[PDB]
Amino acid sequence: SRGELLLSLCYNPSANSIIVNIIKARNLKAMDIGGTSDPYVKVWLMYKDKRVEKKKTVTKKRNLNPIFNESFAFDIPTEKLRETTIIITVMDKDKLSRNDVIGKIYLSWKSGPGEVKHWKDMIARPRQPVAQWHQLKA
Ligand SMILES: [Ca+2]
Ligand SMILES: [Ca+2]
Ligand SMILES: [Ca+2]
Ligand SMILES: [Ca+2]
């Protein structure tokens, strides 16, 4: 159990855009020896197996329940929706080694049940932000 992340998705087909809001996380795994992590969240837009664009939040120091409230806009033509995946990875920044992966969420029509439900809800509710909590998976 790696933690959970609360995020919203808002897709506007007329503008060919999605807004991904990384809201907050809870109960993150501690990936530093003293019982904390320094979390930031990266958001990768994929088209088929290609990386299109990457965005990331600030880093919160020594915080297993960070609150971000950061909003990221991506261009996504309606014609590319079926081939789109949004991969969200919560990371632990480290000074003296490679940053550690806390966990990931994959958003598309071909992911886990909660993820697919959130994606379909976004599609069904154009221009409405839809927020859900997801379990982070290693
Ligand atoms: Ca670490
Ligand atoms: Ca760290
Ligand atoms: Ca490390
Ligand atoms: Ca590093």
Author numbering: 266 to 403
Sentences from the paper on this structure:
Members from the synaptotagmin family form a hierarchy of Ca2+ sensors and are believed to underlie at least in part the distinct Ca2+ dependencies of different forms of regulated secretion. In this context, the C2 domains of synaptotagmin-1 have been the subjects of particularly extensive study. The relation between the functions of synaptotagmins-1 and-7 is particularly fascinating, as data obtained in chromaffin cells suggest that these two isoforms play at least partially redundant roles, and yet synaptotagmin-7 does not function as a Ca2+ sensor for synaptic vesicle exocytosis despite being enriched in synapses.
We describe the crystal structure of the Ca2+-bound synaptotagmin-7 C2B domain at 1.44 Å resolution, which is very similar to that of the synaptotagmin-1 C2B domain. Apart from this expected difference, the structure of the synaptotagmin-7 C2B domain is very similar to the crystal structure of the synaptotagmin-1 C2B domain. We observed three Ca2+ ions bound at the cup shape formed by the top loops of the synaptotagmin-7 C2B domain (loops 1–3). In contrast, the C2B domain of synaptotagmin-1 was found to bind only two Ca2+ ions due to the absence of the serine side chain in loop 3 that helps to coordinate the third Ca2+ ion in the synaptotagmin-1 C2A domain (S235) and the synaptotagmin-7 C2B domain (S362).
